[PDB]
Amino acid sequence: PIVQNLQGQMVHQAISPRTLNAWVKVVEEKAFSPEVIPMFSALSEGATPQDLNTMLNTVGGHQAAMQMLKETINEEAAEWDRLHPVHAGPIAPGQMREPRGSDIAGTTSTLQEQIGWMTHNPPIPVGEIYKRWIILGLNKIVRMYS
């Protein structure tokens, strides 16, 4: 995740095993229960898209649920692109890059780009945006249940 350091900088920190252990445990016990959503949120504070994918990729099994989540993420990514259109061609200077849906999901963006966006002024909170998409998906996994 992104955290504040002593000197006021929003700096990148590695996802702790403590967080991942807690996530694995809630998925094992609460994957299809409402409680997975608050726990997901609580365990992904300041998370980059990379962190969120790390969390999701530790999910063993739950194939149908994971496909439902991926469907939702893809729908939101497609929607993002439509609501945030961009022009073709090279960006003028050496520094820039507007986030596309696949960037927010962390498939076509690097961590440094994600940090770049998240720490820009004003922030482009790609971590929070992706988190919303995941939560939308988790709500479908709960709402459709079986």
UniProtKB/Swiss-Prot annotation:
Site, as annotated: Cis/trans isomerization of proline peptide bond: 89-90
Cellular localisation: Virion
Residues bearing PTM Phosphoserine: 16
Region ranges (Interaction with human PPIA/CYPA and NUP153): 57-95
PTM comment, free text: Phosphorylated possibly by host MAPK1; this phosphorylation is necessary for Pin1-mediated virion uncoating.
Quaternary assembly: Homodimer; the homodimer further multimerizes as homohexamers or homopentamers. Interacts with human PPIA/CYPA; This interaction stabilizes the capsid. Interacts with human NUP153. Interacts with host PDZD8; this interaction stabilizes the capsid. Interacts with monkey TRIM5; this interaction destabilizes the capsid.
Function: Forms the conical core that encapsulates the genomic RNA-nucleocapsid complex in the virion. Most core are conical, with only 7% tubular. The core is constituted by capsid protein hexamer subunits. The core is disassembled soon after virion entry. Host restriction factors such as TRIM5-alpha or TRIMCyp bind retroviral capsids and cause premature capsid disassembly, leading to blocks in reverse transcription. Capsid restriction by TRIM5 is one of the factors which restricts HIV-1 to the human species. Host PIN1 apparently facilitates the virion uncoating.
Identification of the protein by name: Capsid protein p24
The encoding gene: gag-pol
